[PDB]
PDB file of all heavy atoms in Angstrom:
ATOM      1  N   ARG C 268      15.532  12.452  11.332  1.00  2.00           N
ATOM      2  CA  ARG C 268      15.807  13.592  12.216  1.00  2.00           C
ATOM      3  C   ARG C 268      14.526  14.335  12.558  1.00  2.00           C
ATOM      4  O   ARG C 268      14.469  15.563  12.547  1.00  2.00           O
ATOM      5  CB  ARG C 268      16.847  14.544  11.617  1.00  2.00           C
ATOM      6  CG  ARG C 268      18.198  13.853  11.351  1.00  2.00           C
ATOM      7  CD  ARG C 268      19.316  14.774  10.785  1.00  2.00           C
ATOM      8  NE  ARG C 268      19.610  15.854  11.719  1.00  2.00           N
ATOM      9  CZ  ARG C 268      20.392  15.745  12.795  1.00  2.00           C
ATOM     10  NH1 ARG C 268      20.978  14.592  13.108  1.00  2.00           N
ATOM     11  NH2 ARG C 268      20.566  16.799  13.584  1.00  2.00           N
ATOM     12  N   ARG C 269      13.487  13.558  12.857  1.00  2.00           N
ATOM     13  CA  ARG C 269      12.275  14.049  13.474  1.00  2.00           C
ATOM     14  C   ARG C 269      12.487  14.184  14.988  1.00  2.00           C
ATOM     15  O   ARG C 269      13.297  13.469  15.582  1.00  2.00           O
ATOM     16  CB  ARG C 269      11.114  13.078  13.228  1.00  2.00           C
ATOM     17  CG  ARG C 269      10.423  13.252  11.888  1.00  2.00           C
ATOM     18  CD  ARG C 269       9.054  12.529  11.892  1.00  2.00           C
ATOM     19  NE  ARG C 269       9.209  11.104  12.016  1.00  2.00           N
ATOM     20  CZ  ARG C 269       8.217  10.268  12.287  1.00  2.00           C
ATOM     21  NH1 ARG C 269       7.002  10.741  12.559  1.00  2.00           N
ATOM     22  NH2 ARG C 269       8.485   8.982  12.358  1.00  2.00           N
ATOM     23  N   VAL C 270      11.711  15.070  15.606  1.00  2.00           N
ATOM     24  CA  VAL C 270      11.760  15.341  17.038  1.00  2.00           C
ATOM     25  C   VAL C 270      10.636  14.553  17.700  1.00  2.00           C
ATOM     26  O   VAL C 270       9.471  14.680  17.322  1.00  2.00           O
ATOM     27  CB  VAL C 270      11.620  16.850  17.328  1.00  2.00           C
ATOM     28  CG1 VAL C 270      11.674  17.147  18.826  1.00  2.00           C
ATOM     29  CG2 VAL C 270      12.728  17.587  16.664  1.00  2.00           C
ATOM     30  N   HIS C 271      10.982  13.730  18.671  1.00  2.00           N
ATOM     31  CA  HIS C 271      10.075  12.870  19.405  1.00  2.00           C
ATOM     32  C   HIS C 271      10.342  13.022  20.891  1.00  2.00           C
ATOM     33  O   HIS C 271      11.500  13.188  21.295  1.00  2.00           O
ATOM     34  CB  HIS C 271      10.262  11.379  19.083  1.00  2.00           C
ATOM     35  CG  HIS C 271      10.038  10.988  17.656  1.00  2.00           C
ATOM     36  ND1 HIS C 271       8.825  10.548  17.187  1.00  2.00           N
ATOM     37  CD2 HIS C 271      10.901  10.866  16.633  1.00  2.00           C
ATOM     38  CE1 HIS C 271       8.939  10.229  15.914  1.00  2.00           C
ATOM     39  NE2 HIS C 271      10.194  10.404  15.557  1.00  2.00           N
ATOM     40  N   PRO C 272       9.314  12.927  21.717  1.00  2.00           N
ATOM     41  CA  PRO C 272       9.534  12.918  23.167  1.00  2.00           C
ATOM     42  C   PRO C 272       9.884  11.544  23.684  1.00  2.00           C
ATOM     43  O   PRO C 272       8.982  10.793  24.048  1.00  2.00           O
ATOM     44  CB  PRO C 272       8.185  13.376  23.731  1.00  2.00           C
ATOM     45  CG  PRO C 272       7.153  12.979  22.673  1.00  2.00           C
ATOM     46  CD  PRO C 272       7.876  12.863  21.366  1.00  2.00           C
ATOM     47  N   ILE C 273      11.178  11.224  23.741  1.00  2.00           N
ATOM     48  CA  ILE C 273      11.668   9.913  24.122  1.00  2.00           C
ATOM     49  C   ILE C 273      12.677  10.083  25.245  1.00  2.00           C
ATOM     50  O   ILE C 273      13.136  11.185  25.529  1.00  2.00           O
ATOM     51  CB  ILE C 273      12.306   9.186  22.934  1.00  2.00           C
ATOM     52  CG1 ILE C 273      13.354  10.084  22.273  1.00  2.00           C
ATOM     53  CG2 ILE C 273      11.193   8.766  21.938  1.00  2.00           C
ATOM     54  CD1 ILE C 273      13.879   9.546  20.932  1.00  2.00           C
ATOM     55  N   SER C 274      13.009   8.968  25.897  1.00  2.00           N
ATOM     56  CA  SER C 274      13.803   9.014  27.117  1.00  2.00           C
ATOM     57  C   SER C 274      15.275   8.886  26.777  1.00  2.00           C
ATOM     58  O   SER C 274      15.671   8.035  25.981  1.00  2.00           O
ATOM     59  CB  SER C 274      13.375   7.959  28.151  1.00  2.00           C
ATOM     60  OG  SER C 274      13.019   6.738  27.584  1.00  2.00           O
ATOM     61  N   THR C 275      16.065   9.816  27.318  1.00  2.00           N
ATOM     62  CA  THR C 275      17.476   9.957  27.003  1.00  2.00           C
ATOM     63  C   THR C 275      18.208  10.344  28.282  1.00  2.00           C
ATOM     64  O   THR C 275      17.604  10.859  29.220  1.00  2.00           O
ATOM     65  CB  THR C 275      17.684  11.010  25.891  1.00  2.00           C
ATOM     66  OG1 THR C 275      19.016  10.915  25.360  1.00  2.00           O
ATOM     67  CG2 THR C 275      17.433  12.449  26.406  1.00  2.00           C
ATOM     68  N   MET C 276      19.525  10.162  28.288  1.00  2.00           N
ATOM     69  CA  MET C 276      20.316  10.471  29.473  1.00  2.00           C
ATOM     70  C   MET C 276      20.458  11.983  29.581  1.00  2.00           C
ATOM     71  O   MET C 276      21.198  12.599  28.817  1.00  2.00           O
ATOM     72  CB  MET C 276      21.675   9.795  29.407  1.00  2.00           C
ATOM     73  CG  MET C 276      22.154   9.395  30.794  1.00  2.00           C
ATOM     74  SD  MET C 276      22.763  10.813  31.715  1.00  2.00           S
ATOM     75  CE  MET C 276      24.267  11.050  30.798  1.00  2.00           C
ATOM     76  N   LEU C 277      19.775  12.561  30.553  1.00  2.00           N
ATOM     77  CA  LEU C 277      19.510  13.984  30.607  1.00  2.00           C
ATOM     78  C   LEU C 277      20.448  14.776  31.517  1.00  2.00           C
ATOM     79  O   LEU C 277      20.280  15.994  31.643  1.00  2.00           O
ATOM     80  CB  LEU C 277      18.086  14.199  31.083  1.00  2.00           C
ATOM     81  CG  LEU C 277      17.604  15.611  30.780  1.00  2.00           C
ATOM     82  CD1 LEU C 277      17.517  15.866  29.285  1.00  2.00           C
ATOM     83  CD2 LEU C 277      16.286  15.741  31.416  1.00  2.00           C
ATOM     84  N   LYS C 278      21.396  14.133  32.179  1.00  2.00           N
ATOM     85  CA  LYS C 278      22.207  14.845  33.155  1.00  2.00           C
ATOM     86  C   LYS C 278      22.889  16.029  32.485  1.00  2.00           C
ATOM     87  O   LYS C 278      23.345  15.939  31.349  1.00  2.00           O
ATOM     88  CB  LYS C 278      23.239  13.900  33.777  1.00  2.00           C
ATOM     89  CG  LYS C 278      24.102  14.533  34.841  1.00  2.00           C
ATOM     90  CD  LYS C 278      25.027  13.513  35.434  1.00  2.00           C
ATOM     91  CE  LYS C 278      26.312  13.436  34.654  1.00  2.00           C
ATOM     92  NZ  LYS C 278      27.371  14.170  35.408  1.00  2.00           N
ATOM     93  N   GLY C 279      22.929  17.159  33.180  1.00  2.00           N
ATOM     94  CA  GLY C 279      23.542  18.354  32.638  1.00  2.00           C
ATOM     95  C   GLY C 279      22.608  19.240  31.844  1.00  2.00           C
ATOM     96  O   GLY C 279      23.020  20.325  31.413  1.00  2.00           O
TER      97      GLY C 279
END
Side-chain angles (χ1 to χ4, degrees):
Chain C
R268 300 182 61 81
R269 277 196 295 167
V270 180
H271 299 267
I273 52 190
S274 38
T275 194
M276 213 283 288
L277 197 65
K278 182 177 89 102

